[PDB]
UniProtKB/Swiss-Prot annotation:
This is CD44 antigen. Hyaluronan binds at R22, R59, Y60, Y86. Cell-surface receptor that plays a role in cell-cell interactions, cell adhesion and migration, helping them to sense and respond to changes in the tissue microenvironment. Participates thereby in a wide variety of cellular functions including the activation, recirculation and homing of T-lymphocytes, hematopoiesis, inflammation and response to bacterial infection. Expressed in the intestinal epithelium. N-glycosylated. O-glycosylated; contains chondroitin sulfate glycans which can be more or less sulfated. It comes from the Eukaryota. Glycans are attached at N6, N38, N81, N92, N102. It is found in: Cell membrane; Cell projection, Microvillus; Secreted. Interacts with PKN2. Interacts with TIAM1 and TIAM2. Interacts with HA, as well as other glycosaminoglycans, collagen, laminin, and fibronectin via its N-terminal segment. Interacts with UNC119. Interacts with PDPN (via extracellular domain); this interaction is required for PDPN-mediated directional migration and regulation of lamellipodia extension/stabilization during cell spreading and migration. Interacts with RDX, EZR and MSN (via FERM domain). Interacts with EGFR. Interacts with CD74; this complex is essential for the MIF-induced signaling cascade that results in B cell survival. The chain holds residues 23 to 171 of 778 of the full protein. The lectin-like LINK domain is responsible for hyaluronan binding. Disulfide bonds join C9-C111, C34-C100, C58-C78. Residues 13-102 form the Link domain.
Length: 150
């Protein structure tokens, strides 16, 4: 009973979370997952400030109100070569990665590793945070509050 959560650097408190190496998070699960990191889904303004500090990914993820990809450099296979916060307009499907916002993180680029999941609750799952440098933090718990996300 295991969940892998790949996380990034934080930029103005904003970071990306990919679950189990595939698009697999619902919007309800995303809010709960960010809450386990004492975080919330970013607002569009928070995401734009993070972009300005150096944040970009090549993955769709929830923010408050939309699913987006922050882009700095144009790349044909990432958000159709767009720059800025690219907003997903048309999709059949509901599951993506998520972004999260932690207000207590440093104001600009923070590329230290994540070493805690501070607000998960009691449960049976081995949750492993996987940093980009491969370092891992694991703890037994749960973060999903909606049964249909389990
Ligand atoms: C202590 C401490 C802080 C971190 C860290 O990188 N975090 C990021 C994801 C905002 C916070 C939620 C735990 N890891 O350990």
């Amino acid at each position: 009973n295991q969940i892998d959560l790949n996380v990034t650097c934080r930029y103005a408190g904003v970071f990306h979370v990919e679950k189990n190496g595939r698009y697999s998070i619902s919007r309800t699960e995303a809010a709960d997952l960010c809450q386990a990191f004492n975080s919330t889904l970013p607002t569009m303004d928070q995401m734009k400030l993070a972009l300005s500090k150096g944040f970009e990914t090549c993955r769709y993820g929830f923010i408050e109100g939309n699913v987006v990809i922050p882009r700095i450099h144009p790349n044909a296979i990432c958000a159709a070569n767009h720059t800025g916060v690219y907003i997903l307009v048309t999709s059949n499907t509901s599951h993506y990665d998520t972004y999260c916002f932690n207000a207590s993180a440093p104001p600009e680029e923070d590329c230290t590793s994540v070493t805690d999941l501070p607000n998960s609750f009691d449960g049976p799952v081995t949750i492993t945070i996987v940093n980009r440098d491969g370092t891992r933090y694991s703890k037994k718990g749960e973060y999903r509050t909606h049964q249909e996300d389990i």
